[PDB]
Amino acid sequence: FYIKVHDTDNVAIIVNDNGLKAGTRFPDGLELIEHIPQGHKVALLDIPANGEIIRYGEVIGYAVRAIPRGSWIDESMVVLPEAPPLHTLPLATKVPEPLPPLEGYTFEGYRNADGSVGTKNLLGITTSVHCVAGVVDYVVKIIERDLLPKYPNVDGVVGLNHLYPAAVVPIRTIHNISLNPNFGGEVMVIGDEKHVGFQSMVEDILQIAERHLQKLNQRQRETCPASELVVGMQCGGSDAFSGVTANPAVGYASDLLVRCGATVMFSEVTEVRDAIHLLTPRAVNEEVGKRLLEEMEWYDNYLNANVVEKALGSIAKSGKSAIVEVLSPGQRPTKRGLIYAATPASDFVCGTQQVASGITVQVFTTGRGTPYGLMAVPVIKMATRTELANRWFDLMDINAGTIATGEETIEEVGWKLFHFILDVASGKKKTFSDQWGLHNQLAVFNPAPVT
Amino acid sequence: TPTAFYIKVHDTDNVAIIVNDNGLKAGTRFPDGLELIEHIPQGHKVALLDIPANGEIIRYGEVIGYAVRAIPRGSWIDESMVVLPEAPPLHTLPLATKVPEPLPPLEGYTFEGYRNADGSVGTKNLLGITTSVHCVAGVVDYVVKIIERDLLPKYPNVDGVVGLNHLYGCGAPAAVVPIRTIHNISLNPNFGGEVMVIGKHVGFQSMVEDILQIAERHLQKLNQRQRETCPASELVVGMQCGGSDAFSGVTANPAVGYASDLLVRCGATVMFSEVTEVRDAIHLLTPRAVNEEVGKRLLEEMEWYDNYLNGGLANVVEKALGSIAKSGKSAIVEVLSPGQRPTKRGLIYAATPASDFVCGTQQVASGITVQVFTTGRGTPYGLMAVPVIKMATRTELANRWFDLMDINAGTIATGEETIEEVGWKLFHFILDVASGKKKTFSDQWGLHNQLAVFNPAPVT
Ligand SMILES: [Ca+2]
Ligand SMILES: [Ca+2]
Ligand SMILES: [Ca+2]
Ligand SMILES: [Ca+2]
Ligand SMILES: [Ca+2]
Ligand SMILES: [Cl-]
Ligand SMILES: [Cl-]
Ligand SMILES: [Cl-]
Ligand SMILES: [Cl-]
Tell me the angle at which helices A246-259 and A410-426 cross, rounded to the nearest 10 degrees. 60
Could you tell me which residues are beta bridge partners of residue A311?
none
Contact at 8 Å (CB) between B260 and B331?
no
Strand positions, DSSP E, B233-308: 236-241, 269-272
3-state helix, strand, coil in chain A (%, to 5): 35, 20, 50
Distance, in Å, from the CA atom of B181 to the CA atom of B366, rounded to the nearest integer, reads 8
Contact A199, A205 (CB under 8 A): no
- Measured distance CA(B328)–CA(B348) in Å, rounded: 12
B297-329: b (≥16 Cβ within 10 Å) or e: bbbebbeebeeeeeeeeebebbbbbbbbbbbbe
B138 and A346 within 8 Å at the Cβ level: the answer is: no
CA dihedral B395, B396, B401, B406 (to 10 degrees): -10
Alpha-carbon distance of A56 to A277, in angstroms, equals 14
- The resolution in Å comes to 2.8
Where residue B435 falls (left for φ over 0; alpha for ψ -120 to 50; beta otherwise) is alpha
Asked if A391 lies within 8 A of B202 by C-beta distance, the reply is: yes
Pairwise CA distance, residues A163 & A330, whole Å: 14
Write the CA distances from A71 to A31, A117, A309, integer angstroms.
Answer: 9, 53, 18
- How many other β-carbons are positioned within 10 Å of the β-carbon of residue A348? 20
Q: Is residue B288 classed exposed, middle or buried when 0-12, 13-18 and 19+ CB atoms within 10 A define those classes?
A: buried
Sign of the dihedral defined by the CA atoms of residues A145, B440, A132, B163, in that order: negative
B126-130 and B160-163: which strand pairing?
A: parallel
Please provide the size of chain B in residues: 460
Distance from residue B418's CA to the centre of ligand 4 (Å): 8
What is the interface size between A and B, counted as CB pairs within 8 Å?
119
Contacts of A406 (CB under 8 A, 6+ apart): A1
Neighbouring C-beta atoms of residue B102, cutoff 10 Å: 11
Question: Letter for the amino acid at A341?
Answer: A
The Cα-based distances of B320 to B82, B174, B176, B253 in angstroms read 16, 28, 29, 11
Distance B185 CA to ligand 5 centre (A): 25
**Calpha distance A423→A171 (Å, rounded):** 33
SS3 A106: strand
User: What is the number of residues in chain A?
Assistant: 451
Radius of gyration for the alpha carbons in chain A, expressed in angstroms and rounded: 24
Please tell me the distance in Å from B240's CA to the nearest CA on chain A. 14
H-only helix segments in B309-379 = 316-324, 356-366
Element (H, E) at A357: helix A347-357
Question: Would you say A396 and A389 are in contact if contact means Cβ atoms under 8 Å apart?
Answer: yes
- d(Cα B434, Cα B347) in Å, to the nearest integer? 19
- Nearest CA to B237 out of B133, B391, B85, B83 is that of B391
| Cβ burial, residue B86 (10 Å; 0-12/13-18/19+) | exposed
Tell me phi and psi for residue A123, to 5 degrees.
-105, 120
Whole-number Å distance between alpha carbons of A448 and B310: 10
Give, rounded to a whole angstrom, the gap between the first and last alpha carbons of chain B.
59
Of the CA atoms within 13 Å of residue B407, those in its CB half-sphere come to: 30
Task: Using alpha carbons, select from A47, A50, A75 the residue that is nearest to residue A64.
Answer: A50
Give B74's strand partners. none
Residue B252 host element (H or E): helix B252-265
d(CA B279, CA B353): 11
Closest CA relative to residue A409, chosen from A177, A249, A230, A180: A249
**Which string of DSSP letters, residue by residue, matches B207-224?**
HHHHHHHHHHHHHHHHTT
**Spatial separation of the C-alpha atoms in residues B444 and B423, rounded to whole Å:** 23
Task: Decide: B73 and B50 in contact? Cβ < 8 Å.
Answer: yes
Distance CA B94, CA B261 (A): 23
Task: Say which amino acid occupies B100.
Answer: P
CATH number among 2.30.130.110, 3.20.20.70, 1.10.260.30, 1.10.240.10, domain B1-85:
2.30.130.110
**CA–CA separation, B157 and A441 (whole Å):** 28
Contacting residues of A for B382, CB less than 8 Å apart: 134
Phi/psi at A162 (5° precision): -85, 155
Dihedrals φ, ψ of B297, to 5°?
A: -65, -30
- What residue segments make up the domains of chain B, in order of their start? 1-85, 101-105+231-445, 126-222
- The residues near B2 (Cβ < 8 Å, ≥ 6 apart) are none
* Interface with B, mutate which of A146, A164, A173 (most B CBs under 10 A): A164
Partner residue facing A392 (CB), from B169, B204, B446: B204
Contact assessment for residue B235 and residue B268, using Cβ atoms and an 8 Å cutoff:
yes
Do residues A236 and A369 lie in contact, with contact meaning Cβ atoms separated by under 8 Å?
no
- Other beta carbons less than 10 A from residue A402's beta carbon: 20
Query: What is the bridge-based pairing of β-strands A106-111 and A78-79?
Result: unpaired
Tell me the β-bridge partners of B407: B391
Instruction: Tell me the residue type at B445.
Output: W
Name the closest residue on chain A to residue B383, using Cα atoms: A134
Q: How many angstroms separate the alpha carbon of residue B428 from the centre of ligand 9?
A: 8
Per CB-CB distance under 8 Å, the chain B contacts of A447 are 458-459
Strand order in the sheet with A41-43: A2-3, A11-14, A41-43, A72-73
Is residue A124 within 8 Å of A160, Cβ to Cβ? Answer: yes
CB A124, CB A283: distance < 8 Å: no
B355 contact partners, CB below 8 Å, separation of at least 6: A164, A450, A451, B452
Q: How far is CA A321 from CA A92, A256, A280, in A?
A: 12, 10, 12
Residues 6 or more apart in contact with residue B269 via CB below 8 angstroms = B235, B236, B237, B263, B342, B345, B346, B348, B367
The residues that bridge with B334 in the sheet, in sequence order, are: B348
The DSSP call for residue B29 is B
Which residues does chain A break after (C to N > 2.5 Å)?
A: 164, 191, 304
Other CB atoms within a 10 A radius of the CB of residue B153 amount to 9
Q: Are B329 and B394 in contact (CB under 8 A)?
A: no
CA dihedral B409, B411, B417, B419 (to 10 degrees): 30
- Judging contacts by C-beta atoms under 8 Å, the chain A residues touching residue B379 are 132, 134
Query: Rounded distance, CA B1 to CA A434, Å?
Result: 59
Rg (CA), chain B: 24
Single out the residue of B311, B325, B310 nearest to residue B277, CA to CA.
B325
- CB atoms near residue A203 (< 10 Å): 9
Q: β-pairing, B196-197 with B126-130?
A: parallel
Q: How far is CA B389 from CA A76, B256, B341, B380, B392, in A?
A: 59, 11, 22, 12, 10
CA distance A340 to A318: 9
Strand partners, B55: none
Relative to the alpha carbon of A406, which ligand is closest? 2
Strand-pair partners of B18: B6
Single-letter code of the amino acid located at A55? R
Task: Determine whether the interchain pair B381/A134 forms a contact, defined as Cβ–Cβ distance below 8 Å.
Answer: yes
What is the rounded distance in angstroms from the CA atom of residue A162 to the CA atom of residue B355? 12
Residue A137 C-alpha, separation from nearest chain B C-alpha, in angstroms: 7
Q: How was this structure determined?
A: X-ray
Q: Which of A121, A359, A148, A362 is nearest to A221 (CA)?
A: A121
What residues have their beta carbon closer than 5 A to ion ligand 1? Answer: A 234, 345, 347, 350
Collapsing DSSP to helix, strand or coil, B160 comes out as strand
Alpha-carbon distance of A74 to B257, in angstroms, equals 63
Closest CA to B36 of B22, B21, B46: B46
Instruction: Return the DSSP state at A31.
Output: B
d(CA A336, CA A6): 29
CA B136 to each of CA A30, B141, B170, B171, B458: distance values in angstroms, whole numbers, following the listed order = 39, 12, 11, 12, 20
Ramachandran region, residue B22 (left: φ > 0; alpha: ψ -120 to 50; beta: rest): left
User: CA A197 → CA A204, A346, B395, B398, B446, distances in Å?
Assistant: 11, 40, 14, 10, 16
Angle at A197 between CA B2 and CA B364, to 5 degrees: 110
Q: What phi, psi does B395 have (nearest 5°)? A: -65, -35
B53 min Cα distance to partner chain A (Å): 34
Alpha-carbon gap, residue B21 to B40, rounded angstroms = 11
Q: Decide if A365 contacts A242 (C-beta within 8 A).
A: yes
Helices (H), B368-451: 395-400, 419-435, 441-445
The Cα–Cα gap between B225 and B228 comes to 10
Interchain pair A390, B203: CB under 8 A: no
Residues 6+ apart with CB under 8 A from A200: none
**If we measure between CA atoms, which residue out of B148, B127, B251, B133 comes closest to residue B190?**
B127
Give the one of A132, A135, A164 whose C-beta lies nearest to B355's C-beta. A164
Rounded CA-CA distance B129/B135 in Å is 14
* A437 vs B contacts (CB less than 8 Å): 142
d(CA A374, CA A390): 23
User: What burial letters (b/e) apply to B169-186, b meaning 16+ CB within 10 Å?
Assistant: beeeeebebbbbbbbbbb
The phi and psi torsions of B390 (rounded to 5 degrees) equal -100, 120
Class of domain A1-81: mainly beta
**A interface test, pick of B131, B403, B447 with most A CB neighbours within 10 Å:** B403
Whether residues A436 and B357 touch (CB distance < 8 A) is answered with no
Q: How far is CA B392 from the centre of its chain?
A: 13
* Closest among B192, B120, B121, B119 to B431, alpha carbons compared: B121
SS3 assignment, position B6: strand
Expressed in angstroms and rounded, the spacing between residue B362 Cα and the centre of ligand 3 is 11
Helices (H), A236-285: 246-259, 269-272
Q: How far apart are CA B29 and CA A446, in angstroms?
A: 52
A391: three-class secondary structure by DSSP: helix
* B400·A195 Cβ contact <8 A: yes
CB A300: neighbour CB atoms within 10 A?
12
Distance, in Å, from the CA atom of B38 to the CA atom of A368, rounded to the nearest integer, reads 72
In angstroms, the separation between the Cα of residue A428 and the nearest Cα of chain B is 23
